[PDB]
Every structure is written in structure tokens, then in C-alpha cells.
Structure 1
Amino acid sequence: ASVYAWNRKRISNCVADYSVLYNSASFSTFKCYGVSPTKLNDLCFTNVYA
């Protein structure tokens, strides 16, 4: 969707797999602020907004 109507998806009750996220090299920028990309799989969160 266009930037002004940016889509917001709530994510919860799932077992995430960020390994697929940072292994793929198609993503030119994978900047993570406040969290370590390597250490993400160790942490638990209440919910995610995409």
C-alpha cells in the first residue's frame, strides 16, 4: 500500500523465525534499533506491529 495508508498488521500467538529474515540478502537495509539482530530469537515479546 501507499505510504500514507501504510498497512498495519498485528502479529501475535506465533513462533517467529527471524533467521529467514536476516539470512536472505535481498534486503538492502536490515537496520535494527534497540535490539540485536543476532540475539532476536532469544527474546520474547507481547506482540508485533508490521
Structure 2
Amino acid sequence: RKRISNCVADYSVLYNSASFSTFKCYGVSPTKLNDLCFTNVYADSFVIR
């Protein structure tokens, strides 16, 4: 779990990349992220089947 903070995130570039087989947002829309100001972000990475 890598913490993200004290930065400006341009989520548009992540969503526009077709390399991702799944990009699903459950409480927000990916387009709206670009205009949204958050408290803290937890980026968790793992490899699964």
C-alpha cells in the first residue's frame, strides 16, 4: 500500500490508456476525478490470477 499525497493527479492520462483491461470506479466516475479534491489516496498493488 503506497501512500499518495501532497500532489496533483491527472487521472485523465491513466483512463485514456488502453493497456488497462479493467478500469472500474465504484464511488466516482473516472471523468469526474480530474475536477475532484481528495483527502488521502491509498494505491495498493498486487498480482493475482
- Which TM-score band (shorter chain)? 0.7 to 0.9
Which structure 2 residue ranges, 5 or more long, are not aligned?
Answer: 44-49
Which structure 1 residue ranges, 5 or more long, are not aligned?
Answer: 1-7
Let me know the Cα RMSD of the aligned residues. Answer: 0.6
- Greater fraction strand: 2
- Taking structure 2 as the reference length, the TM-score comes to 0.83
TM-superposed CA distance for 1:47, in Å, is: 0.9
In structure 2, distance between residues paired with 1:19 and 1:42: 10
2:19 corresponds in structure 1 to 26
* Number of residue pairs the alignment of both structures matches: 43
- Taking structure 1 as the reference length, the TM-score comes to 0.81
Deviation beyond 6 Å, 4+ runs, structure 1: none
Overall identity of the aligned pairs, in %: 100
TM-superposed CA distance for 1:30, in Å, is: 0.1
Report Cα offsets for 1:27-50 as digits up to 9, x if no partner.
Answer: 000000010111111110011000
TM-superposed CA distance for 1:19, in Å, is: 1.0
